Amino acid sequence: DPAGARTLVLMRHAAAGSAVRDHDRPLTPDGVRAATAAGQWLRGHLPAVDVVVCSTAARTRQTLAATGISAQVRYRDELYGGGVDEILAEVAAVPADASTVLVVGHAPTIPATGWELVRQSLLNRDADPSSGAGDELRHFAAGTFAVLSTTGAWADLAQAGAELQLVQHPVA
């Protein structure tokens, strides 16, 4: 039945400064360091990212740039303030044979998305409904990412859910 797991990385952009338009706010120097560290970790520890879905905001674009990940990128205004359902609709639309997908977006939606996927996966696995699975997402500062795994096709992610593997917190 399953035939391999797909890897989903849900990232909140790194720390950003001030600008006269919110969408133009740049990373701070500490946010650049945090995004750089996150990229180094991702490229050293996970399969190469195949597809990135990224908010059009400067800070999300810049976070991606700082990671050093070269992949096909889908920039989406839907990720600039979209909710869980919008983020999942965009993940569902990626090339189906992608093995590893990175999402670079904003809180609160990014951690909420992870949490919903975890709870759906619990349900599908007939887990104990008092399970604390997903509680690691309770801290999700700028630059954090969660790594999840699913056996479902990308299109089916909302129904299939995903299991949380790790949450990597910013180190700068």
Side-chain angles (χ1 to χ4, degrees):
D1 184 25
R6 288 170 182 78
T7 300
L8 179 64
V9 183
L10 298 177
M11 185 169 188
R12 178 183 181 181
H13 65 78
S18 68
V20 300
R21 291 209 307 231
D22 176 87
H23 193 258
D24 293 333
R25 288 165 59 220
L27 294 180
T28 64
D30 286 337
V32 172
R33 281 181 281 278
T36 300
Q40 287 169 358
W41 191 98
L42 288 165
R43 292 182 283 99
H45 292 87
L46 298 187
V49 168
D50 301 300
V51 177
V52 182
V53 191
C54 188
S55 171
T56 51
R59 60 195 177 269
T60 41
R61 292 175 179 274
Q62 287 171 7
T63 294
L64 177 60
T67 68
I69 293 167
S70 179
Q72 52 182 290
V73 184
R74 299 159 76 98
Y75 292 103
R76 295 288 183 271
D77 287 322
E78 296 79 351
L79 267 56
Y80 179 67
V84 173
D85 304 316
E86 290 73 31
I87 278 46
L88 295 178
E90 292 299 329
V91 174
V94 302
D97 292 334
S99 303
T100 310
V101 175
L102 172 61
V103 179
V104 186
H106 305 266
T109 293
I110 285 289
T113 301
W115 189 83
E116 290 205 356
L117 289 173
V118 164
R119 296 325 283 190
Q120 183 69 25
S121 182
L122 287 175
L123 171 60
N124 292 342
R125 283 152 39 211
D126 190 21
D128 187 316
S130 62
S131 176
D135 281 348
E136 299 92 326
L137 302 163
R138 69 188 182 279
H139 292 117
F140 213 102
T144 302
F145 62 86
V147 181
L148 307 97
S149 183
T150 187
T151 59
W154 296 115
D156 291 342
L157 183 63
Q159 294 64 43
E163 290 188 69
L164 180 61
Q165 304 308 300
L166 60 103
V167 181
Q168 285 293 135
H169 302 269
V171 288

